[PDB]
Amino acid sequence: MSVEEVSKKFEENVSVDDTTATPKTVLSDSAHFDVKHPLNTKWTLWYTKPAVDKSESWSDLLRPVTSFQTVEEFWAIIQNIPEPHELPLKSDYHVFRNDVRPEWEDEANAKGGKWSFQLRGKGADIDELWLRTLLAVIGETIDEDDSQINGVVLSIRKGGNKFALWTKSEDKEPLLRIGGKFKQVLKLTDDGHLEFFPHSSANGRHPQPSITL
Ligand SMILES: C[n+]1cn([C@@H]2O[C@H](COP(=O)(O)OP(=O)(O)O)[C@@H](O)[C@H]2O)c2nc(N)[nH]c(=O)c21
């Protein structure tokens, strides 16, 4: 049947009196201190190889997979080093979960924006350094980025690599600042080429995005 005592314990007023609940905790556990593979966030791994969506479906190509809180897995997609000008270009990798993670169609819905960077000059080893910065930004206890952002993405094209950074809402202010740096990490210079667009682009780009080098 349904039976419940009648005592109730309402006596935990500690708004500004420090957490006196020292000996009384719900879970005194905090491993953390990893940085050896497992970071501290959840991020799925959806990468797109083909592009037959023309007749198939952008969702029929994109392969959603590896969803962990470490770096070994993400490093795996890089282990193939197909991004640094090693694959059939037109590539598109995506990993995230912090605040959103539905897809470029809603990852912007996350309430952040989509920073892209179209590279032309070939370096043969640029997608490895820019990735270590994206895959690490997810968490890697880096702070100052794995919390204000929501997810990242990567995509190559005919002689035109293109990466994507999906913020969670940090505001374009800190983006025009980050994008600027992330724009150089690509090791470019021909014209600081790059693209700045808020979710408003993946859902009705009525207003203006940000810029496009
Ligand atoms: C990431 N993403 C890409 N596409 C489509 O895939 C096409 C890619 O064409 P593109 O802009 O030349 O990039 P790519 O060929 O290197 O991928 C675009 O026209 C997009 O509309 C997508 N379409 C949907 N619905 N959702 C997504 O998340 C998504």
From Swiss-Prot:
The protein's matches in PROSITE patterns, at most eight in alphabetical order, are given as: IF4E (PS00813)
The record, for Gene3D superfamilies, names:
RNA Cap, Translation Initiation Factor Eif4e
Phosphothreonine sites (modified residues): T22
For this protein, the record's InterPro entries field holds: TIF_eIF4e-like, TIF_eIF_4E, TIF_eIF_4E_CS
Listed under GO cellular component are:
cytoplasm; cytoplasmic stress granule; eukaryotic translation initiation factor 4F complex; nucleus; ribosome
Can you say where in the cell this protein is located?
Cytoplasm; Nucleus
Question: Is RNA-binding among the key words of this record?
Answer: yes
Top-level lineage group = Eukaryota
Question: Which of the residues bear the PTM Phosphoserine?
Answer: S2, S15, S28, S30
**Glycyl lysine isopeptide (Lys-Gly) (interchain with G-Cter in ubiquitin) cross-link site:** K114
Keywords for this protein: Cytoplasm, Initiation factor, Isopeptide bond, Nucleus, Phosphoprotein, Protein biosynthesis, RNA-binding, Translation regulation, Ubl conjugation
Q: Is Ubl conjugation one of the keywords UniProt gives this record?
A: yes
Q: Which GO terms describe its biological process?
A: nuclear-transcribed mRNA catabolic process, nonsense-mediated decay; positive regulation of formation of translation preinitiation complex; regulation of cell cycle; regulation of translational initiation; translational initiation
Assign the protein's first listed, main location to one coarse class: cytoplasm
A GO molecular function held by the record:
mRNA cap binding
Task: State the oligomer form and interacting partners.
Answer: Component of the eIF4F complex, which composition varies with external and internal environmental conditions. It is composed of at least eIF4A (TIF1/TIF2), eIF4E (TIF45) and eIF4G (TIF4631 or TIF4632). Interacts with PAT1 in a RNA-dependent manner. eIF4E is also known to interact with other partners.
* Other remarks on this protein: Present with 14200 molecules/cell in log phase SD medium.
Described purpose of this protein according to its UniProt entry: Recognizes and binds the 7-methylguanosine (m7G)-containing mRNA cap during an early step in the initiation of protein synthesis and facilitates ribosome binding by inducing the unwinding of the mRNAs secondary structures.
> Would you identify the family this protein belongs to, as annotated?
Belongs to the eukaryotic initiation factor 4E family.
User: What is this protein called in UniProt?
Assistant: Eukaryotic translation initiation factor 4E
Q: Which organism is it from?
A: Saccharomyces cerevisiae (strain ATCC 204508 / S288c)
Gene from which the chain derives:
CDC33
